[PDB]
Amino acid sequence: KPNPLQDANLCSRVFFWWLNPLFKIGHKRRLEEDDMYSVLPEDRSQHLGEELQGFWDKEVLRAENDAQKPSLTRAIIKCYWKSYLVLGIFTLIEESAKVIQPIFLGKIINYFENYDPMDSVALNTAYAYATVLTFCTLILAILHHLYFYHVQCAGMRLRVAMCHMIYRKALRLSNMAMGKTTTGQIVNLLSNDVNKFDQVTVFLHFLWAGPLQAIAVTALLWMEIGISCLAGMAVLIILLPLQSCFGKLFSSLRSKTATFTDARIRTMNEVITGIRIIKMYAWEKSFSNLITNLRKKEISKILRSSCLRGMNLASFFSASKIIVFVTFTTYVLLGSVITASRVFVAVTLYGAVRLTVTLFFPSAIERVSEAIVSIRRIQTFLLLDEISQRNRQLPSDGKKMVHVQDFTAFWDKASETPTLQGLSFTVRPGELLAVVGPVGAGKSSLLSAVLGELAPSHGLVSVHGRIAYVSQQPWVFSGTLRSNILFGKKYEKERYEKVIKACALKKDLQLLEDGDLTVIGDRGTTLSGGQKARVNLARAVYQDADIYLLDDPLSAVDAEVSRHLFELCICQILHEKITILVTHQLQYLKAASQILILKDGKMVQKGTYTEFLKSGIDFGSLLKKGFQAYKNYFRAGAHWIVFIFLILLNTAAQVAYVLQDWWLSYWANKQSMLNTEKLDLNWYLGIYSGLTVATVLFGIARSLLVFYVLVNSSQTLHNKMFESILKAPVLFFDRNPIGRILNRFSKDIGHLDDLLPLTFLDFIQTLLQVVGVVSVAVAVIPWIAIPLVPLGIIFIFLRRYFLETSRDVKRLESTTRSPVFSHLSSSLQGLWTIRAYKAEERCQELFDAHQDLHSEAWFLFLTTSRWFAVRLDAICAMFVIIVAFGSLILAKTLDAGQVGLALSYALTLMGMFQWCVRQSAEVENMMISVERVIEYTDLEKEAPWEYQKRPPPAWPHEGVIIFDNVNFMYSPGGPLVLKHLTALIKSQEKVGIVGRTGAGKSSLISALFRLSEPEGKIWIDKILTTEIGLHDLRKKMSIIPQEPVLFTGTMRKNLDPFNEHTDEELWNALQEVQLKETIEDLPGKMDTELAESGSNFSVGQRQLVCLARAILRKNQILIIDQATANVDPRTDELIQKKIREKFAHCTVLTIAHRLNTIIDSDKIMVLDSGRLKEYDEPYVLLQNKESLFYKMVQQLGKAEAAALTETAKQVYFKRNYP
């Protein structure tokens, strides 16, 4: 991958010519890492990191010498100033040209108003001034982009060096430092804060260019016009504190609305998660009411924020007109006269100085402040303590011995109890030493202390040679499994075969698709704990070390793999090297050569297994303690009348803005065509003031109207799509994951609320300004129309060409920015294992490779943007030059003011055109959010909540249930879960459900509740179920679900959301719940707000609340879903006794995984994969030995079978023969 920047002439380099092959490839097909362009060797991360290491270490040596604090800022400056000053020189000369251009404009105009048809020397001077103006425009619009690239490349180099520094420091930090900090912040700053370096460098050079430019412009204007320069500069400067005040107010309002935004996101996540339960309880009306209220409360604040944003933007639009109006009002009232030169000189100078002062200086100052904060945080992290080096790399002469004497170490020095006390043990190669103790006694602490990560407070420790160690928690860095096993060591086929046959990993190889080359992501999401432990053991054994340390490696695996691993990896292999192992399994201690008992940090007994057996101490005892999107989006706002009014207001404001300078030109022309008689100042000043105030008012009104319409459209879209999704069937929510359905609630709507209105308004404003300037340029000289068509077609083709390649780069960089973060996270998580081996330069090298790839993506992203910018500026400069030369060529018929207006607007098209193009690209890129929202607008709807045929309020009188050829089906074109159910359910009877967790169980509940449209005929009290509205059906059929889930809020709403009960009834029912005393201790008597899903409550309390809601809704027909899964037997017997003592007159359908709760049931469905097999009394069912219910009973055993038979028979005799 050669870098063409190596072979690039300066003429080609300035024009960015070398990117032509890459852009041709991007047009032909897509982009990928293969098409990537390798970075310059100087741009590599390793060299920058080495330089920054040298400089930072030098300054910290200086700081230690001088007895003072260090300075990352000082190090960075002393590293980069010598190579950053030349770009400052270049920006100085560029700004000199930028400020000298209007003087040449004034000279050319000065030629115009003194026209002489027969003169030639004046025309030659005019051409000379025009061509030096061409030089000025070309140098402003050509070399500026190369300077910008070099500035941003210096910033990128700085960011890369800082990242390499922070990773290198993180990989070599101490245990106390890790305890103080966390893996979250340490990746958070590297992901967010360091990115300020790629933005601060861009505006940095304007700190020393702003005031100098302002002073130069002020001096020029003081020379040109007179006293009005002070007034103009004062008005322009007063804008800045106003900008700061609006920024502060907007930030405060955004912080105020953030809490409402977070509350809405949290509650909508909650309803999405608990959507099956909320659908089965028919509280979606209350939830929709709450969401609507919160949405209105949020929309008020965001409407205020949008209004403030629009006011700020309109004030920006009218600032230049206000400044020039004040300046010229002072100019005329002082007693001076108006010509056609000074007018446009002042206008252009104001444009330039206003742009610099308002758009660059404050952004530069705030980015510098943010970068200083970033450097302060980075140095705060960097000055953290470091692990003391041990025995350098390897000076020892092998010394294959391990010894520990009088060892007492502290995990923390502040604690009073040493973790381990007075360790004394030595081990030799070929010894199978082991340690056994209670969980948490410090065996892992002993292992780590041997690893050297624990500072020896007392005694001596001597371990020599490279060490292989396995952590208790499995760790695998993301990548190919072969790479994880190899650890970076060279590949040996026979060794890999021996390891793979010894570790019994062939099963994992054949299970995984790629086998040995399978890709594993973060935290081993593609594998299991046992597989990860086996992988770690395989890596350790392949390392082929001398001292082996294992921390409970066989705990999270089965017996066969554990015995195979232990035997055929130690008993015939590790009997020659140093082996220290800790196990919670006592079976393997027979083969252990040495065994130690450790508890309370002190040794108890060390010896052989037979010696411990003779001692009589029990180890076990010790172990136990497009366009249509635009059309719909704009229609959702308001009717087209408001749209045409808005476009008319846009046109009126733009025409007034142009007419202000046109009136200046007309005033200059009329003054020139004179002669004493004096022009009536009142008329012209009044018309000028009227035009200026019209511009300001129309801009304000336009911005407010645009924001109002867009915000109203967003609100209407959100309401419509939420109302649509709330009525969506459960199939949509089963198919779409929770994260996917919440993404368009938390992100797309957010963008539609706070970014699309402003961005669209800014784009339309810039487009109107550009089209107005071009219209002026055409109107002044009608002949400029001819080149305009080729210019436009060339621009359109260029935009398409650049956009067909920019998207690929912008997505490739985003994709490539994640692996560095993943690598940092995984390496930090496995830091103990990483430092156990001497190998860390390899980890540094892979980090360097990932950083190089990310920097390569950044480099291409920079170069493509610079190429597009230079092409656009070339076109704009061509326009400027053609306007100027046409004006000079046809000067015999024009006049000074008209020419000046034309050429000044041609001058100011610079930057405006670029901003318009960039904002158009951003808008067409980000429209995808409302595309997703409108896609969510029209999900399919279920049956209407209320039918025309309203059921009688008294139904059900009895509760007879009829199943007639009932077939349930999860989705169309899917398996038939239920097959022709035919049964009758009488009034006030108890029905059980048997079988297995493969018969459907919940399928019947889904059919009755109609989560999905079923097939067949079901009659409830001689009424066909399909003819009852969903709210008129589910409201009168209660259920206690799989997992009870309480909802965020108070108990009052969380029990009776629709509020048809009384406080006395609430307290009474809660008293029979027996949680009344449990709840009458909270800060609120009954209004205490609960945590998420009752985190402070127990599952039994959840079940009690559910049965409370059931008894309060007191419908005849109820269903219970596996009331006990892992609940304590006390709360179990409570819930069964309540359910059997409160529902004597209520029909109940019971489903459960255990027969004891349903052995007393009068009747039972026998279900098998949706097929009804038997239906009779349970004792009659078990009377037949061939019955499947009897087989299920006999599966458990005999004594429980006998008890169930006794209970069923006594129920049968008591009921049938009273």
Ligand SMILES: Nc1ncnc2c1ncn2[C@@H]1O[C@H](COP(=O)(O)OP(=O)(O)OP(=O)(O)O)[C@@H](O)[C@H]1O
């Ligand atoms: N980062 C740490 N800071 C303080 N103490 C620690 C740290 N890591 C481990 N420990 C100590 O290690 C013990 C917890 O280890 P663990 O529960 O894994 O059992 P163990 O007795 O060390 O050995 P084994 O893992 O073999 O069962 C506690 O004594 C705890 O204080």
Ligand SMILES: Nc1ncnc2c1ncn2[C@@H]1O[C@H](COP(=O)(O)OP(=O)(O)OP(=O)(O)O)[C@@H](O)[C@H]1O
């Ligand atoms: N969300 C789902 N989408 C599609 N099929 C499903 C879904 N949930 C379950 N199934 C399938 O439907 C059948 C029965 O579903 P279910 O899991 O309710 O049965 P069960 O185990 O007998 O009951 P329970 O869920 O009460 O334990 C099985 O084949 C199961 O794989």
Ligand SMILES: O=c1[nH]cc(F)c(=O)[nH]1
């Ligand atoms: O010409 C411009 N340059 C930079 C900007 F941010 C902007 O709005 N306009």
Ligand SMILES: [Mg+2]
């Ligand atoms: Mg431990």
Ligand SMILES: [Mg+2]
């Ligand atoms: Mg199931």
